[PDB]
């Protein structure tokens, strides 16, 4: 940067998709314990087509 | 069944029913023969020997064990192939298919010419004296123990040795221990529901289990997972 000789970096550049200074609460984070519940029902659902 | 067929020798009934002072006249010779139609009226198949003996087919006719009662299978010897009732009713006629079989007496009429097939059997377990050995199974007992009194009973009924009232009793007890034994030797144990479980949970049915002597029946249906 002109003024400050301090201001360097790396080529990495990104984001994390946080909320105030914690750790990123993903869309696939918010939509896995509802996968989990499906696939546990689509279990008993097997198991009863089964019998 | 739960429990296990231990074998016991037959006066082990005539120990149980002499106790009653009118039953004293009841003898080995009475007891073999009643033992044998409660046997077979109960018709209970863990009470017999299963036993497989191989033979020869001579032209659509083979000899057959001396001592078979019932059949549980009948499959081809070179390929494991199961037999079914027959059928037809010009089985070996000419005039001018799959295998199959039917056994009248001594004799077995498989619609096959000149083979050997396996009959998978049941027989009566013998004594040392060639004599039924019963299980010692105490409900098993008791009931055969009922049958014989009831029919005593009977009898001496007929003469008017006993009162209707006697007979009325005998005849109601020995109707509840008979069906306490049919219940005691046809609920399955344990492992027995666990072989009914894996034949009932089919996502694919299996429904071809007869051909192989039902070896793969109680086998569990495993499903990849993708």
């Given at each position: 940067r002109l003024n400050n000789p301090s201001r360097c970096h790396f080529g990495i550049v990104g984001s994390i998709y946080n909320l105030n200074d914690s750790?990123?609460?993903s869309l696939?984070?918010?939509?896995?314990?509802?996968?989990?519940?499906?696939?546990?029902?689509?279990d008993r659902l097997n198991k009863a087509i089964a019998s | 069944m739960v429990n296990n067929i231990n074998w016991v020798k037959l006066p082990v009934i005539l120990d149980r029913l002499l106790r009653h002072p009118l039953l004293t006249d009841l003898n080995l010779e009475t007891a073999i023969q009643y033992t044998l139609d409660f046997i077979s009226a109960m018709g209970l198949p863990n009470v017999?020997?299963?036993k497989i003996e191989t033979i020869d087919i001579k032209e659509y006719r083979g000899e057959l064990p001396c001592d078979l009662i019932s059949i549980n299978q009948v499959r081809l010897h070179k390929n494991?192939?199961?037999?079914?009732?027959?059928?037809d009713n010009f089985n070996a006629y000419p005039t001018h298919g799959e295998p199959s079989f039917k056994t009248q007496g001594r004799v077995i009429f498989t619609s096959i010419k000149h083979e050997k097939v396996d009959i998978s059997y049941k027989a009566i377990m013998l004594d040392d004296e060639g004599l039924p050995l019963i299980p010692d199974n105490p409900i098993f007992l008791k009931t055969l123990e009922l049958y014989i009194k009831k029919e005593w009973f009977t009898i001496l009924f007929d003469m008017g040795k006993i009162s209707p009232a006697?007979?009325?009793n005998t005849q109601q007890e020995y109707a509840f221990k008979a069906g306490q034994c049919n219940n005691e030797f046809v609920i399955p144990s344990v492992s027995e529901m666990e072989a009914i479980t894996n034949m009932?949970?089919?996502?694919?049915?299996?429904?071809?289990?007869?051909?192989?002597?039902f070896k793969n029946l109680g086998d569990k249906e495993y499903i990849r997972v993708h």
């Open positions: 750790r990123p609460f696939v984070d918010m939509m896995k314990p509802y996968n989990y519940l499906y696939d546990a029902i689509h | 017999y020997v299963d494991g192939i199961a037999l079914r009732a027959m059928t006697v007979l009325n009932w949970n089919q996502l694919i049915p299996r429904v071809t289990e007869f051909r192989r002597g």
